[PDB]
Design an enzyme around this catalytic site. Sequence first.
Site, mmCIF file in Angstrom:
data_model
loop_
_atom_site.group_PDB
_atom_site.id
_atom_site.type_symbol
_atom_site.label_atom_id
_atom_site.label_comp_id
_atom_site.label_asym_id
_atom_site.label_seq_id
_atom_site.Cartn_x
_atom_site.Cartn_y
_atom_site.Cartn_z
ATOM 1 N N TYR A 1 7.682 29.456 32.272
ATOM 2 C CA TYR A 1 6.929 30.370 32.850
ATOM 3 C C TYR A 1 7.000 31.782 32.282
ATOM 4 N N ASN B 1 8.560 35.611 43.252
ATOM 5 C CA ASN B 1 7.714 34.584 42.591
ATOM 6 C C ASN B 1 7.841 34.917 40.979
ATOM 7 N N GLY C 1 2.455 28.976 45.292
ATOM 8 C CA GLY C 1 2.916 30.465 45.903
ATOM 9 C C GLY C 1 2.599 31.739 45.047
ATOM 10 N N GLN D 1 51.355 54.572 33.101
ATOM 11 C CA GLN D 1 52.818 53.650 33.324
ATOM 12 C C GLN D 1 53.703 53.007 32.312
HETATM 13 C C1 F43 Z 1 8.266 19.164 42.742
HETATM 14 C C2 F43 Z 1 7.331 20.555 42.497
HETATM 15 C C3 F43 Z 1 7.408 21.127 43.905
HETATM 16 C C4 F43 Z 1 8.295 22.202 43.762
HETATM 17 O O1 F43 Z 1 8.771 23.059 44.459
HETATM 18 N N1 F43 Z 1 8.641 22.519 42.422
HETATM 19 C C5 F43 Z 1 8.250 21.612 41.619
HETATM 20 C C6 F43 Z 1 9.061 20.910 40.500
HETATM 21 C C7 F43 Z 1 9.943 22.265 39.964
HETATM 22 C C8 F43 Z 1 11.089 21.485 39.021
HETATM 23 C C9 F43 Z 1 10.733 20.354 38.098
HETATM 24 C C10 F43 Z 1 11.983 19.984 37.379
HETATM 25 C C11 F43 Z 1 11.831 18.349 37.352
HETATM 26 O O2 F43 Z 1 10.894 17.847 36.820
HETATM 27 O O3 F43 Z 1 12.862 17.464 37.708
HETATM 28 C C12 F43 Z 1 11.500 22.962 38.505
HETATM 29 C C13 F43 Z 1 11.920 22.643 36.981
HETATM 30 C C14 F43 Z 1 12.526 23.647 39.103
HETATM 31 C C15 F43 Z 1 13.883 23.112 39.069
HETATM 32 N N2 F43 Z 1 14.161 22.629 40.342
HETATM 33 O O4 F43 Z 1 14.678 23.350 38.172
HETATM 34 C C16 F43 Z 1 10.351 23.735 38.295
HETATM 35 N N3 F43 Z 1 9.290 22.989 39.232
HETATM 36 NI NI1 F43 Z 1 7.083 23.354 39.118
HETATM 37 N N4 F43 Z 1 7.342 24.074 37.183
HETATM 38 C C17 F43 Z 1 6.421 24.357 36.342
HETATM 39 C C18 F43 Z 1 5.155 24.430 36.465
HETATM 40 C C19 F43 Z 1 4.596 23.574 37.628
HETATM 41 C C20 F43 Z 1 3.177 23.064 37.654
HETATM 42 C C21 F43 Z 1 2.730 22.480 36.479
HETATM 43 C C22 F43 Z 1 1.258 21.900 36.471
HETATM 44 C C23 F43 Z 1 0.871 21.205 35.396
HETATM 45 O O5 F43 Z 1 -0.199 20.893 34.904
HETATM 46 O O6 F43 Z 1 1.959 20.570 34.599
HETATM 47 C C24 F43 Z 1 3.085 22.804 38.983
HETATM 48 C C25 F43 Z 1 2.309 23.857 39.986
HETATM 49 C C26 F43 Z 1 0.868 23.974 39.694
HETATM 50 O O7 F43 Z 1 0.028 23.021 39.570
HETATM 51 O O8 F43 Z 1 0.437 25.319 39.366
HETATM 52 C C27 F43 Z 1 4.201 22.572 39.477
HETATM 53 C C28 F43 Z 1 4.499 21.885 40.575
HETATM 54 C C29 F43 Z 1 5.860 21.539 40.893
HETATM 55 N N5 F43 Z 1 7.112 22.005 40.581
HETATM 56 C C30 F43 Z 1 6.110 20.333 41.900
HETATM 57 C C31 F43 Z 1 6.056 18.972 41.157
HETATM 58 C C32 F43 Z 1 4.836 18.786 40.097
HETATM 59 C C33 F43 Z 1 4.539 17.320 39.618
HETATM 60 O O9 F43 Z 1 4.869 16.521 40.717
HETATM 61 O O10 F43 Z 1 4.505 17.148 38.600
HETATM 62 N N6 F43 Z 1 5.417 23.269 38.610
HETATM 63 C C34 F43 Z 1 4.338 25.291 35.568
HETATM 64 O O11 F43 Z 1 3.037 25.478 35.718
HETATM 65 C C35 F43 Z 1 4.796 25.764 34.419
HETATM 66 C C36 F43 Z 1 6.243 26.108 34.284
HETATM 67 C C37 F43 Z 1 7.068 24.705 34.850
HETATM 68 C C38 F43 Z 1 8.419 24.910 35.289
HETATM 69 C C39 F43 Z 1 9.638 24.676 34.310
HETATM 70 C C40 F43 Z 1 9.468 25.812 33.015
HETATM 71 O O12 F43 Z 1 9.206 26.939 33.481
HETATM 72 O O13 F43 Z 1 9.969 25.517 31.879
HETATM 73 C C41 F43 Z 1 8.654 24.079 36.547
HETATM 74 C C42 F43 Z 1 9.787 24.713 37.602
HETATM 75 C C1 F43 Z 2 47.657 56.960 38.546
HETATM 76 C C2 F43 Z 2 48.280 55.736 39.666
HETATM 77 C C3 F43 Z 2 47.432 56.539 40.974
HETATM 78 C C4 F43 Z 2 46.439 55.539 40.985
HETATM 79 O O1 F43 Z 2 45.495 55.897 41.582
HETATM 80 N N1 F43 Z 2 47.123 54.391 40.519
HETATM 81 C C5 F43 Z 2 48.039 54.698 39.367
HETATM 82 C C6 F43 Z 2 47.852 54.055 38.214
HETATM 83 C C7 F43 Z 2 47.344 52.686 38.010
HETATM 84 C C8 F43 Z 2 46.681 52.092 36.598
HETATM 85 C C9 F43 Z 2 47.776 52.361 35.634
HETATM 86 C C10 F43 Z 2 47.491 51.888 34.234
HETATM 87 C C11 F43 Z 2 47.970 52.868 33.272
HETATM 88 O O2 F43 Z 2 49.363 52.974 33.205
HETATM 89 O O3 F43 Z 2 47.193 53.422 32.441
HETATM 90 C C12 F43 Z 2 46.639 50.564 37.128
HETATM 91 C C13 F43 Z 2 46.986 49.577 36.156
HETATM 92 C C14 F43 Z 2 45.116 50.551 37.705
HETATM 93 C C15 F43 Z 2 44.197 50.290 36.672
HETATM 94 N N2 F43 Z 2 43.485 51.635 36.334
HETATM 95 O O4 F43 Z 2 44.140 49.530 35.699
HETATM 96 C C16 F43 Z 2 47.625 50.508 38.240
HETATM 97 N N3 F43 Z 2 47.844 51.721 38.656
HETATM 98 NI NI1 F43 Z 2 49.637 51.820 39.851
HETATM 99 N N4 F43 Z 2 50.379 49.932 39.294
HETATM 100 C C17 F43 Z 2 51.593 49.412 39.791
HETATM 101 C C18 F43 Z 2 52.500 49.930 40.627
HETATM 102 C C19 F43 Z 2 52.477 51.350 40.798
HETATM 103 C C20 F43 Z 2 53.855 51.909 41.259
HETATM 104 C C21 F43 Z 2 54.919 51.713 40.239
HETATM 105 C C22 F43 Z 2 55.984 52.344 40.596
HETATM 106 C C23 F43 Z 2 57.206 52.375 39.481
HETATM 107 O O5 F43 Z 2 58.414 52.150 40.088
HETATM 108 O O6 F43 Z 2 56.887 51.799 38.571
HETATM 109 C C24 F43 Z 2 53.295 53.334 41.912
HETATM 110 C C25 F43 Z 2 53.288 53.487 43.232
HETATM 111 C C26 F43 Z 2 54.574 53.338 43.990
HETATM 112 O O7 F43 Z 2 55.416 54.171 43.881
HETATM 113 O O8 F43 Z 2 54.656 52.576 44.927
HETATM 114 C C27 F43 Z 2 51.976 53.421 41.240
HETATM 115 C C28 F43 Z 2 51.398 54.560 41.126
HETATM 116 C C29 F43 Z 2 50.206 54.671 40.172
HETATM 117 N N5 F43 Z 2 49.406 54.018 39.910
HETATM 118 C C30 F43 Z 2 49.963 56.334 39.684
HETATM 119 C C31 F43 Z 2 50.458 56.369 38.423
HETATM 120 C C32 F43 Z 2 52.003 56.296 38.452
HETATM 121 C C33 F43 Z 2 52.934 57.025 37.253
HETATM 122 O O9 F43 Z 2 52.643 58.137 37.079
HETATM 123 O O10 F43 Z 2 53.754 56.107 36.621
HETATM 124 N N6 F43 Z 2 51.605 52.193 40.675
HETATM 125 C C34 F43 Z 2 53.579 48.892 41.295
HETATM 126 O O11 F43 Z 2 54.245 49.218 41.896
HETATM 127 C C35 F43 Z 2 53.559 47.464 40.648
HETATM 128 C C36 F43 Z 2 52.053 47.327 40.329
HETATM 129 C C37 F43 Z 2 51.588 48.150 39.299
HETATM 130 C C38 F43 Z 2 50.098 47.816 38.778
HETATM 131 C C39 F43 Z 2 49.922 46.863 37.454
HETATM 132 C C40 F43 Z 2 50.225 45.253 37.779
HETATM 133 O O12 F43 Z 2 49.982 45.105 38.955
HETATM 134 O O13 F43 Z 2 50.488 44.596 36.591
HETATM 135 C C41 F43 Z 2 49.544 49.087 38.575
HETATM 136 C C42 F43 Z 2 48.152 49.018 38.844
#
Ligand code: F43
Ligand code: F43
Lengths: 558, 558, 433, 264
Positions: B341, B490, B454, B154
């Site tokens: 993790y 998980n 879990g 175009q």
């Molecule tokens: C509140 C929950 C329940 C829940 O739904 N998610 C939590 C917390 C959530 C938060 C903790 C962020 C924060 O500290 O504010 C995040 C980072 C997820 C998030 N919201 O971005 C996370 N755990 Ni959890 N959580 C983790 C883990 C764990 C391990 C940690 C055990 C230990 O001895 O420290 C235990 C589960 C278990 O006993 O197996 C655990 C529990 C829990 N996990 C207990 C909080 C435990 C506590 O009171 O200290 N996570 C892990 O086992 C390792 C990876 C680690 C994650 C962060 C990372 O991957 O870098 C984090 C993954």
């Molecule tokens: C190949 C098609 C068929 C299709 O599926 N899409 C096309 C082409 C496609 C390409 C053109 C890019 C390029 O030039 O390589 C793009 C930009 C979409 C894309 N792939 O990124 C586009 N049209 Ni079209 N296309 C447009 C339009 C139009 C108008 C242009 C008529 C004129 O008098 O110039 C006519 C439809 C109509 O007659 O109503 C039209 C057709 C057509 N449109 C005919 C090519 C027409 C030609 O041979 O020149 N577009 C418009 O009407 C205005 C907006 C304009 C779009 C780009 C923008 O919005 O900035 C573009 C939107």
Amino acid sequence: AYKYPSEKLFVEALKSKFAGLDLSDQKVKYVRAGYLQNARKREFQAAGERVAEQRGMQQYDVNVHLGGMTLGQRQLVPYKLSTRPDIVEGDDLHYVNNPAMQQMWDDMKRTIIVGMDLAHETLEKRLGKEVTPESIAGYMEAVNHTMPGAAIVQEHMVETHPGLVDDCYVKMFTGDDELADEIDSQYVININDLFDKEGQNEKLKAAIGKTTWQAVHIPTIVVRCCDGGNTSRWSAMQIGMSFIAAYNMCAGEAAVADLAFAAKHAAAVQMAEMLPARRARSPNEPGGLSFGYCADMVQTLRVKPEDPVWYTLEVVACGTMLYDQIWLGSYMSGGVGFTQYATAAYTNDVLDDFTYYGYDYALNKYGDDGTAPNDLATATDLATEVTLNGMECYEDYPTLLEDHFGGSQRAGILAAASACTTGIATGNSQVALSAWYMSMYVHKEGWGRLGFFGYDLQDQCGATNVCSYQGDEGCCLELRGANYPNYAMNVGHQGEYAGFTGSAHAGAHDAYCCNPLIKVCFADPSLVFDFSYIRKEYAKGAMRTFRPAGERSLVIPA
Amino acid sequence: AYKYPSEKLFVEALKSKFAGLDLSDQKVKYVRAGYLQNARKREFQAAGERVAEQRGMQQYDVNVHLGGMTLGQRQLVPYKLSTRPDIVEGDDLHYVNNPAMQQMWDDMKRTIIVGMDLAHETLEKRLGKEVTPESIAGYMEAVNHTMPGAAIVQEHMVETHPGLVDDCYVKMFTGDDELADEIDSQYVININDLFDKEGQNEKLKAAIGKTTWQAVHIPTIVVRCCDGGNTSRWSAMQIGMSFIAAYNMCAGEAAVADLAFAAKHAAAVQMAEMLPARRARSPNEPGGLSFGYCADMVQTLRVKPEDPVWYTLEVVACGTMLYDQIWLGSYMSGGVGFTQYATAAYTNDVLDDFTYYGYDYALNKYGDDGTAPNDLATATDLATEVTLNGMECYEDYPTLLEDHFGGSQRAGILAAASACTTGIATGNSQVALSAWYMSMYVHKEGWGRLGFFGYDLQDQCGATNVCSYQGDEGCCLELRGANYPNYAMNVGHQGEYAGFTGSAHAGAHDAYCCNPLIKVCFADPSLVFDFSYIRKEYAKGAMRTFRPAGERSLVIPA
Amino acid sequence: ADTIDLYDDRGKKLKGDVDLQAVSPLKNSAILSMVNTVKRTVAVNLAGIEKACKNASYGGQSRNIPGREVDIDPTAKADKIAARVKELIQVEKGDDTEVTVLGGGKFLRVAAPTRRIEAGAEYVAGMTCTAAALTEALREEYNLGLYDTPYVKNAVWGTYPQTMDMKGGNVLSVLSIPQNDEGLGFALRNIMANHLAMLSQRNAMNCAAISSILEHCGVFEMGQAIGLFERYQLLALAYQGLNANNMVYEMTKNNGKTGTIGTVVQETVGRALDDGVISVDKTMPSGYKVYKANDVCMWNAYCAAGTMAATMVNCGALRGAQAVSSTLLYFNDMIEKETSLPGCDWGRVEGTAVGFSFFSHSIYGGGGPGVFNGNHVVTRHSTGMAIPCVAVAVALDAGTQMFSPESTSAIVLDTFQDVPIMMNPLKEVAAAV
Amino acid sequence: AYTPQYYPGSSHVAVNRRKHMSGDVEKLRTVSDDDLVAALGHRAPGADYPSTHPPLAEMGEPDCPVRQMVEPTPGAAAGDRVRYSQFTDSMYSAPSIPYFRSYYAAINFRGVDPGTLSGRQIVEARERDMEAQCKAAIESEMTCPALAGLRGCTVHGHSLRLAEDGMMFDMLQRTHIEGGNVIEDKDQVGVPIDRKVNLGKPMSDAEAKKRTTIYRTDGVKYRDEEEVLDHVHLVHHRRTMYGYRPETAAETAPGVGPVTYHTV
Ligand code: F43
Ligand code: F43
Ligand SMILES: C[C@@H](OP(=O)(O)O)[C@H](NC(=O)CCCCCCS)C(=O)O
Ligand SMILES: O=S(=O)(O)CCS
Ligand SMILES: O=S(=O)(O)CCS
Ligand SMILES: [Cl-]
Ligand SMILES: [Cl-]
Ligand SMILES: [Cl-]
Ligand SMILES: [K+]
Ligand SMILES: [Kr]
Ligand SMILES: [Kr]
Ligand SMILES: [Kr]
Ligand SMILES: [Kr]
Ligand SMILES: [Kr]
Ligand SMILES: [Kr]
Ligand SMILES: [Kr]
Ligand SMILES: [Kr]
Ligand SMILES: [Kr]
Ligand SMILES: [Kr]
Ligand SMILES: [Kr]
Ligand SMILES: [Kr]
Ligand SMILES: [Kr]
Ligand SMILES: [Kr]
Ligand SMILES: [Kr]
Ligand SMILES: [Kr]
Ligand SMILES: [Mg+2]
Ligand SMILES: [Mg+2]
Ligand SMILES: [Mg+2]
Ligand code: NA
């Protein structure tokens, strides 16, 4: 109220693009310069030369364009962000090149809203704990240490670098002013301060009730490595850790699982739900985003509710970029993508002109914001007048038609102007939706063309499905979204739908469209992106003056 | 053949952690230093001070840890990357902090393999085109210009900044040596040069046949903004554009739709398929990654197949980080996550010691690689000896037990050593899987403990589901993956399963485990991450010497 | 009430003045039988199982698991394996279980007993009972043991359960898995058009019938044929799919030699006006006549019949499937311009056709007509009035497609070509009245 | 006897629309077969038609009552490949507008697959049938060789300012003026051809406006074409009403309001 001026709003941008040009002339000289006319294409060509040398393999090369021609046989023109002075090259608005657009989406995706009442009820019922302002204060400190990826319970834990996750935080908010006042304000979204205009704060507090919520924003870097499905899970894990610490629970007892279920499901408000298999996606992705929620994320409504058009068009800018450029143009396709399909709705003040014209037409014919009759006849009148006026503008100003060179762009902007006018006038999203499809039908018969091959699938299904009540057809517009069946595929619609959803609630002078929790959450100025002025943010990204989160400079060589 | 030496392989790391320490001492003096003992925690605390000051809101603070203690009441110890001299702090192996880890996953997620034969058959049948080496060469140039996001058909297209998408490229590969030699080598994965050991190249060419394939790697920045579901779509879009240009097709005719269906589905080989609703995810996400595919991405097998243990443990390192740290520790949960993790399987040469001991035991009892009986008796013998020996190591070396301080870590490493030994000895992944669960059961009765709450869901379901042939229980290990029902939740299993899937084919001296297309695709040295030496790459990321793709420094302010 | 005359695939009258309710999915025993048939019937590719085992290519997609070949020859033991499968899945002697060897041993036709469907919630028991019975039958026939039977199981079941479907497996259905449903009630909508063309043995009148029946069965299950909408859907089924009053057959025949999309438009309008379905409403100053629908649901049914006849005349002339997308679009676009009445499904056929044209002529997805279905995001939007035309177009194609019925659905043809409901659906529906 | 009316409207633009739909379009120029085939770019002038499948008579067909009563086009009988012609038309009063090119094809030609877009309009058909349909369109008043052209790719220009000499912008410049005539010397996908196809003189501006089907402010203003606006409104309203309930009572359902039309 508003008076539409005598100079079209789009003329400034035309003069800034074509200094000295007679804007009525239908012909132009073509000089066939190719890519060397354009600084950005020249920069890209040089960048492709470095890429290919560094990796041993050809990449970008303008000369690979077919036909022995490079881009720019016509003039390659820049784009003015509407309501902004900034004029940028079109490539500066490609989402890949624009960090403001990327951060707006990351800020949406990394957000989850989580109730606290169910968790507090669990602590009372199962542990006999007393929940106080003081215990809540301790919880809020715990959760803002743990949420970015730091440890509070276990020993020998390894943690995220705090500078890589500096955008991650949690705030609480509530309709209960007494509680909001007892918590350190750094931890609270202040509804009363953010929503001081037109009594909006009292509407929000009444809709939320005496309930307590957390706005959770997980790190940008995490959703960039992973997906939007990470958000509610990440939030819940660290919410759980924080409750364990703040209430001296066993670190893993049955009651903890109740907190998990509440945080992950029973009290969790996702930005978007999952999608069917053909387009399988986790939650918190754009296909699942409803138009009501999209409209409620945009915050211009709390800044200047007295101009319903401004907020409406900021919603259009938000939605068209997200839904067309990022969602449809990348998640669901990719490549060069769909930049200008969306820019038509937020550049060169075109939609602004067409919509303020309609607003003035409605004000003078029907009356003030929101008072027009909620019926098909009214949708018909407004849509036809706004569409005809806009078509006449394209016909009378050849460089305006040349800007919206694709019919799909014209169709979306004419129909968005029509539906936004109807929404503001009637205050009804569903009536506005009838106006949207009317515009399409009027447009098609005027010019014997509309959009691309597949543009009006939803629009030919459209009118009959506005007022259907059948299972997979009927739906109010606020709850429709990018997975509403007819809408699931095509550019030039979804962000516009969000826009005039907003327009109907702006016309009605509501404080939100669909969910007050979303509204309050995104009003928070602590987000990276400024949801109150979308097009100003896009300009910053296009000018390389927007700082996004999620970069890895701290842990990479140079 | 290999001879297990007199000094345990893990002793070097213990001496490097504890200079001067008598390694038989069961007692230690605790000084209760807290975080100030550790440079990384001190740096994190200072980073958190900046974060809080810049944004006006508390973030990281070691003193928020419960109980009035900070991390480090015991000694906080570093980690040696197994087979590497590099010793790092534990936080340096958190995936959020480690760009090599992030890029390994991005490199997998942004890859799709797409056949070319169906597309060429379409051009012949529908258009009567001739497909020649010259037309393929023009196509390969077109696709390497367009795939990063640049225009070929175009006019007035806006494009991605080539420097932001410098990692995106497309190479072809084929079992047909005559065609592979006719295409410019920059566009070809040279199977003969990369697979020059033990006749692997001829095995791969025979298994692929005279078919032609494209290895497509879309930009890292795209999958970071979006998700893995973007990959096959983005690829298909620019494949289609390149065929349109390279064969002078109508830019949008019926035959183009056939090319799209081929590129998106009929000839598309995803790295991972979608997941069910509870864990809804797009394709090309880790839950859908089969253990056979994970093992085939790792390339130590083509470098040194005469030491099957080395490749096996590199697969362990690849899989345990991906599945436990990124997938289960972020996508499916988040927070501090699951760094240690996984590090238990790829640090301090512990698993290496246990596994080389087993290899030596099997070599002297059963004979050479791959020749032991493929039966339950043999799995029982190998698993029991390897597990007992490892338990005795933990018992005889108190600091080894202290390293793998969580039972889940010990369980995974003892079982992995057991199953890798069995796989190398028998050449059979399914027999090795029987040994994996045998290790768990032996371990549990020795110490009256195994893993976390879990940990052994799959292990108690384990032995009986190895040789089940029922619908949702029976499955060969190569085709099992992170969505096999018992395995869907998980830590401490999935990457180990990938590891001893590799061990079985390494013991049989095969060139791959499951798909020769995956094997050739990931051998290509043009990928950002070096899939031939996983643990060396992790060391680079931990030391801040790994350069990832996808950064945005070109389009953001300072 | 409404009555229709029923006609067969050669335009011969079968039954007169049939109550429209008598061809309802909820009442007609032949339609109920067709649903039961596609739910419980599966095909087994014994040749594919044999190949997967002998070449250790479990899962397909160029997969090869070196060393794990299992040397078995089920195509040479097909009768013995078929007998064991029958014994393992049959619930009661003389029940409707059928297991038949086809292709000289290469394939098995497996009609699982209806009781196994009844005893479950969905339709998958046919797939799962057959896969399990076959796995057991192979294990016993070839004396497989602990560590090789898992591989043979993957030859049957594909990558299940790492995947949600039997991807790369060798048990086949014209239905998909329930998790692929786009929404509620979509399982009978998820039938690939290439499959529908093979069910009908490329008899385009029978293809219209089979596809229309199954589409409207889906729509009933979606809850979108309740009250007034029952009459709406049943008239569309009768006139578009069941050749009610011979309208589709006659309109196709009278336009088969020289006709076009546009001449079928004109014939549809003329028939509606002559039959009193529409009348002149008002005349504009230019002389253009605005019509009005005297019977709204009947006008839709006439537009549905015209859409189908237009597909048969235009795709028939091309002997090519691809024109169906434009036929559906322009038949309805122009019938609206001709009358100022809304076209079929009030724009939802035209809209489906817009996107279907796009996604059968662009880079973005879709494919040839044969890959679409009523559950496809592109072609789902009309309640049953678009896909029957797509299937008919696929049946009429003389060899222009890459992914043709023979390449994707050959086993479907063999499995159902002796099944009476699929051999003569129109005669069976009429006989059931 | 039903007489088609095709389309509402009383302006000369609506009259032109009905001409395109009804096939009543005047021949304005001649394009030889060899010239058209060279421009289309699918085979050399004079070469046999390639095949995508054997002739129907040779391979036979399934037993199908529809196949037995629908006559294949000559190209379908022969097994031709499905090929295409594609046109772009200027919004500056080109005679053709995309949808009416598609109606022309769909009403007047058998076995065709037309596609409408804003900047391109395509007809796919069996190659020899496609050629006949393209010859009819290109030789007729539906075509001005300056305001319209064959463009199988790189179609940009329908919405752009005309070049100073009246030619619609073509990034590939497949056509250019020589001594008052439009010459085509590249095929429709931009490949140079070894001939100069002389498509004759362009339409004058006044002729284009007399022959155009587009409404715009410098010709027939759309706003004044009430019959067409009435038609649009009526179709939208009835679609809306019947989606709610498919019955006459829906036409006065609550929410319809005081719908009214200009000419009826
Ligand atoms: C509140 C929950 C329940 C829940 O739904 N998610 C939590 C917390 C959530 C938060 C903790 C962020 C924060 O500290 O504010 C995040 C980072 C997820 C998030 N919201 O971005 C996370 N755990 Ni959890 N959580 C983790 C883990 C764990 C391990 C940690 C055990 C230990 O001895 O420290 C235990 C589960 C278990 O006993 O197996 C655990 C529990 C829990 N996990 C207990 C909080 C435990 C506590 O009171 O200290 N996570 C892990 O086992 C390792 C990876 C680690 C994650 C962060 C990372 O991957 O870098 C984090 C993954
Ligand atoms: C190949 C098609 C068929 C299709 O599926 N899409 C096309 C082409 C496609 C390409 C053109 C890019 C390029 O030039 O390589 C793009 C930009 C979409 C894309 N792939 O990124 C586009 N049209 Ni079209 N296309 C447009 C339009 C139009 C108008 C242009 C008529 C004129 O008098 O110039 C006519 C439809 C109509 O007659 O109503 C039209 C057709 C057509 N449109 C005919 C090519 C027409 C030609 O041979 O020149 N577009 C418009 O009407 C205005 C907006 C304009 C779009 C780009 C923008 O919005 O900035 C573009 C939107
Ligand atoms: C139709 C469907 O494609 P398939 O037919 O399933 O290949 C779907 N694509 C789309 O809807 C692409 C929409 C974005 C590109 C076109 C914008 S108009 C998808 O990939 O899931
Ligand atoms: O020409 S098409 O309408 O298929 C695509 C426009 S981007
Ligand atoms: O304590 S639990 O086993 O629930 C979680 C370990 S991370
Ligand atoms: Cl010029
Ligand atoms: Cl009713
Ligand atoms: Cl009625
Ligand atoms: K991402
Ligand atoms: Kr501009
Ligand atoms: Kr840029
Ligand atoms: Kr630590
Ligand atoms: Kr919670
Ligand atoms: Kr979202
Ligand atoms: Kr309307
Ligand atoms: Kr208004
Ligand atoms: Kr039109
Ligand atoms: Kr770090
Ligand atoms: Kr541009
Ligand atoms: Kr392809
Ligand atoms: Kr993956
Ligand atoms: Kr061994
Ligand atoms: Kr135990
Ligand atoms: Kr089947
Ligand atoms: Kr020509
Ligand atoms: Mg002037
Ligand atoms: Mg006001
Ligand atoms: Mg050896
Ligand atoms: Na008027």
